[PDB]
Curated annotation (Swiss-Prot), chains A, B:
It comes from the Eukaryota. This is Fatty acid synthase. It comes from Homo sapiens (Human). The gene is FASN. Ubiquitous. Prominent expression in brain, lung, liver and mammary gland. Homodimer which is arranged in a head to tail fashion. Interacts with CEACAM1; this interaction is insulin and phosphorylation-dependent; reduces fatty-acid synthase activity.
Length: 67, 67
């Protein structure tokens, strides 16, 4: 599955405890091509995710070097 | 439930069929306080909806008419 993200925003940084676990929930809105990651109801990440219909290997040709 | 809708956008009109039924699906993202209404996989209504924490009657006092 080739995927394209857009307008990703990171709202808060989740910290991994030395003991226990953190539950992250992921909800997709397929119609609007949007997603949302949450932890205990507090938004952590937001943006747009959808499938790349027609890949172009040209996009991965290396850019003109700065130097 | 006193509620608040915000930044609502209607993207297309659903035509109610004379015979049959049309099924609308509504999904909520509580953390983002956003909602989407899709019709067979096509976005219809998008915006934000959330509970009104502190209702206040003053907001409904009738504005003095300019005329």
């Amino acid at each position: 599955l080739p995927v394209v993200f857009e307008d990703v925003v990171l709202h808060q940084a989740t910290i991994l405890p030395k003991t226990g676990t953190v539950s992250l929930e992921v909800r997709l809105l397929e119609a609007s091509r949007a997603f949302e990651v949450s932890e205990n109801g507090n938004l952590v990440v937001s943006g747009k995710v959808y499938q790349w219909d027609d890949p172009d290997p040209r996009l991965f040709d290396h850019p003109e070097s700065p130097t």
